[PDB]
């Protein structure tokens, strides 16, 4: 399935909803104001992207979920600490 995510300080579209491996998340926001970095668990916990992490910056980034945990954060200064981070469990 394909789901739109409201990528902002107050992230919407992920809370209390069920996801499955293979689903496509579409991060929507204004290009240049944020980014989407796919990180690992430790990177998610400390709001810091690990070396080589993949960045998406188009404002309408299509990312497929892999089975298990999928972590994403915005890496601009103050944004992750401001709540721009999500952990999705794709069953």
Binding residues: 34, 74, 79, 84
Chain mean position to CA 81? 14
Closer residue to Cu ion, CB minimum distance, 10 or 18: 10
Residue 85 near Cu ion by CB under 5 A: no
Query: Taking Cα atoms as reference points, which of 73, 64, 75 lies closest to residue 21?
Result: 64
Residues 6+ apart with CB under 8 A from 86: 5, 11, 14, 71, 72, 73
3-42 residues in contact with Cu ion (CB under 5 A) are 34
List residues forming the annotated binding site for Cu(+). 34, 74, 79, 84
Out of 5, 36, 37, 74, point to the residue binding Cu ion (CB under 5 A): 74
Residue 76 near Cu ion by CB under 5 A: yes
What whole-number distance in Å separates Cα of residue 84 and Cα of residue 33? 12
Contact residues toward Cu ion (CB under 5 A) are: 34, 74, 76, 79, 84
């Amino acid at each position: 399935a394909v789901y739109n995510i409201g990528w902002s300080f107050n992230v919407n579209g992920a809370r209390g909803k069920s996801f499955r491996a293979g689903d496509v998340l579409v991060f929507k926001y204004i290009k240049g104001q944020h980014n989407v970095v796919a990180v690992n668990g430790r990177g998610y916990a400390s709001c810091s992207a690990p070396r080589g992490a993949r960045t998406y910056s188009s404002g309408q980034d299509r990312i497929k979920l892999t089975r298990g945990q999928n972590y994403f954060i915005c890496s601009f200064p103050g944004h992750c600490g401001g709540g721009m981070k999500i952990a999705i469990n794709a069953k």
